């Protein structure tokens, strides 16, 4: 008669945000299987782009067009960078590799190094961004991924104000068509942050520098910056119930179940 | 009088492929510093794209345009995938994470899974590609990186011939403007390979399936495929002497020293 919890989980795997009893499980599953097969057929026939790759390209274009230098820095980083970030909490979340390296939990340490290095070469202000993989061991799975993709943009020198920071965030999310509000918060590493919220979901943490951590990185200039999770952005944009639908995955492709 | 070996190493750091005694070290270094600062100034003023990101976008466009589905699969993969790949040599090169996961040394295991899964949804033949980070512990540094970027494209079903494989490789490298020759070789995992060579540098290993390893992955169809290192491609394209100039790096940006 009624659907079992397991059957309901199965159908929810196959259900897409835009799909609209007493039909049996077998027929409801058959219908959804058919719809999802067609969705993949249509991607494959027409656009062929992965949502995560595509979102990366669109964001890349956005920040390049606005004068930010595209960075591609190591994903595998020295463990010393974690301790020099003031992280000794987030520390139980570090995936260690060999005795000396770890998978980066954020883009900040490498970007600090780039800011200092490029200050010797580039005119004020220095505007840079990176998009790439980051890793944190996470107890949750609703809004948290162990393997995720962060965007971090930043500016150092002139014009490093809270206004300009907010303006960039605003232009950015309006460009992407993502609703948001900016609330003042704090964290252990940075501040004093600004959190960019979608309802109760954190899209970004942002900071207006300087902060005292800067000195450890040879930075003695005003700066502003923000990190965004690309999977969180996709989750909002596509109305995905679970963030796993927006991840690097063998179970979902563009939020469509691959288990068909 | 003459330059010391250390001074020569310093200048070679600052030397670009296109730059053309008895001038002292200080003046030669000063000149190169000036040229490299201007190179970064010109990137920053004009294009602002990272060579590795840009190469990824151009390759992405190439394979999308030719009917291949863009994949973004996990970088952190189960250790079981390594053993199911027939790897028990390359095994000392695996960067292990936790007791159960590793950093992927190749794209093949995840793409095998995608081929099988998508066969239930997509018409014959199934054409897919991924571009992303791969990791191998490496004794060398001339043509080898521990952290690199692989392109792997493949097709399964109809038209999985050596001719079509060679044709795609040929169209691809001619598109990129990279000189090559295709030699028959072999490896422990696959074959029987075709190696795509630039002089003595391996750009790619390629395979015409089926092979007996397929059965472990639920694959029972003809297939063809090739993996290319993006850093190797950049190394050839830009005439870089060391592959570290083409890597994710805090020491080089688009093959320009960041230590200025
Ligand atoms: C570069 C300069 C010099 C140093 N720092 C400067 C800067 O530009 N800005 C300071 C603020 C950058 C934010 C960054 N350090 C950071 O790690 O903040 P988090 O809030 O911890 O990470 C940003 C978050 O990425 C996403 N994210 C987080 N963990 C997950 C998860 N496990 N699953 C999926 N998504 C997640 C989440 O969407 C977004 O809130
Ligand atoms: C997906 C289907 C199902 C399974 N396999 C199929 C397929 O499409 N093709 C089989 C052939 C794919 C090749 C892949 N399995 C492989 O790992 O071959 P390798 O020769 O070991 O890696 C390809 C190499 O990537 C680059 N590369 C390697 N190690 C490094 C390094 N340490 N530093 C920098 N660059 C490097 C190098 O340019 C290029 O020769």
Note whether B78 and A156 are within 8 A (CB): no
Sequence-separated (6 or more) residues with CB below 8 Å from residue B30: none
Task: Report the number of distinct structural domains present in chain A.
Answer: 2
Instruction: Please tell me the number of Cα atoms within 13 Å of A198 on its side-chain side.
Output: 21
The reply to whether A61 and A136 lie within a common domain is yes
The CA-based diameter of chain B, rounded to the nearest angstrom, is: 72
The reply to whether A30 and A53 lie within a common domain is no
Show the CA angle centred on residue B163, arms to residues B160 and B166, nearest 5°. 100
Q: Which residue has the tokens 């490789």?
A: B169
Ligand with the closest atom to the CA of A85? 1
Chain B residue with CA closest to A260: the answer is B120
- Cα four-point dihedral sign B113, B119, B123, B126: positive
Note whether B127 and B155 are within 8 A (CB): yes
Note whether B203 and B209 are within 8 A (CB): no
Backbone phi and psi for residue B150, each to the nearest 5 degrees, phi listed first: -105, 140
Domain that holds residue B25: 1-48
The reply to whether A192 and A144 lie within a common domain is yes
Cβ neighbour number for residue A62 with a 10 Å cutoff:
18
C-alpha R_g of chain B: 21
The reply to whether B27 and B153 lie within a common domain is no
Which among B227, B237, B247 is the best mutation to test ligand 2's pocket, defined by most ligand atoms within 8 Å of the CB? B227
Q: How far apart are CA A259 and CA A144, in angstroms?
A: 22
Joined together, the tokens standing for residue B133 give: 């980070």
Which helix (H) or strand (E) is A109 found in, with range? helix A108-118
Tell me the DSSP string of B201-259.
EEEEEEEES--GGGGGGT--S-EEEEEEEHHHHHHHHHT-SSGGGGSS-SSEETTEES-
Looking at chain A, which runs of residues are DSSP E strands?
69-71, 76-78, 96-97, 101-103, 126-135, 147-156, 181-185, 193-198, 201-208, 223-229, 252-253, 256-257
Sequence-separated (6 or more) residues with CB below 8 Å from residue B47: A64
How deeply is A222 buried, as exposed, middle or buried, from its count of CB atoms within 10 A (0-12, 13-18, 19+)?
A: middle
The reply to whether B197 and B134 lie within a common domain is yes
Q: How far apart are CA B11 and CA B144, in angstroms?
A: 23
Joined together, the tokens standing for residue A246 give: 């927006």
Sequence-separated (6 or more) residues with CB below 8 Å from residue B84: B109, B216, B217
Sequence-separated (6 or more) residues with CB below 8 Å from residue B45: none
Q: How far apart are CA B103 and CA A239, in angstroms?
A: 31
The reply to whether B201 and B235 lie within a common domain is yes
Instruction: Show the 3-state SS of A29-74.
Output: HHHHHHHHHHHHHHHHHCCCCCHHHHHHHHHHHHHHHCCCEEECCC
The reply to whether A40 and A73 lie within a common domain is no
Q: How far apart are CA A57 and CA B53, in angstroms?
A: 9
Ligand 2 proximity of B232 Cβ (cutoff 6 Å) = yes
Q: Which residue has the tokens 């004020």?
A: A124
Q: How far apart are CA A114 and CA A217, in angstroms?
A: 10
Q: How far apart are CA A220 and CA B59, in angstroms?
A: 40
Show the CA angle centred on residue B9, arms to residues B3 and B15, nearest 5°. 100
Which of A248, A254, A257 is most worth mutating to test chain B (most B CB atoms within 10 A of its CB)? A248
The reply to whether A20 and A78 lie within a common domain is no
Experimental technique used to determine this entry: X-ray
What SS3 state is found at A32?
Answer: helix
Note whether A147 and B74 are within 8 A (CB): yes
What is the domain-level CATH number for residue B171? 3.30.930.10
The reply to whether B3 and B73 lie within a common domain is no
The reply to whether B35 and B75 lie within a common domain is no
The reply to whether B14 and B64 lie within a common domain is no
Resolution, Å (one decimal): 2.1
């Amino acid at each position: 008669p009624a659907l079992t919890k397991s059957q309901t989980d199965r159908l929810e795997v196959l259900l897409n945000p835009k799909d609209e009893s007493g039909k049996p499980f077998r027929e409801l599953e058959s219908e959804l299987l058919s719809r999802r097969k067609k969705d993949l057929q249509q991607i494959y026939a027409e656009e062929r782009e992965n949502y995560l790759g595509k979102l990366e390209r669109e964001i890349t274009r956005f920040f390049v067009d606005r004068g930010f230098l595209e960075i591609k820095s190591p994903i595998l980083i020295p463990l010393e960078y974690i301790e020099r970030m003031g992280i000794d909490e987030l520390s139980k979340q570090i995936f260690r590799v060999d005795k000396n390296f770890c998978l980066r939990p954020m883009l900040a340490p490498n970007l600090y190094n780039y800011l200092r290095k490029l200050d010797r070469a580039l005119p004020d202000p220095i505007k840079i961004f990176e998009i790439g993989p980051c890793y944190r061991k996470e107890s949750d799975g609703k809004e948290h991924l162990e393997e995720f993709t962060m965007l971090n943009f930043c500016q150092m020198g002139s014009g490093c104000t809270r206004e300009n920071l907010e303006s960039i965030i605003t232009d950015f999310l309006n460009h992407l068509g993502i609703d948001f509000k900016i609330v003042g918060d704090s964290c252990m590493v940075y501040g004093d942050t600004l959190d960019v919220m979608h309802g109760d979901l954190e899209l970004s943490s942002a900071v207006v520098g300087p902060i005292p951590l800067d000195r450890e990185w040879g930075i003695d200039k005003p700066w502003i910056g923000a990190g965004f999770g690309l999977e969180r952005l996709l989750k909002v944009k596509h109305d995905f119930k679970n963030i796993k639908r927006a991840a690097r995955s063998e179970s979902y492709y563009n939020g469509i179940s691959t288990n068909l």
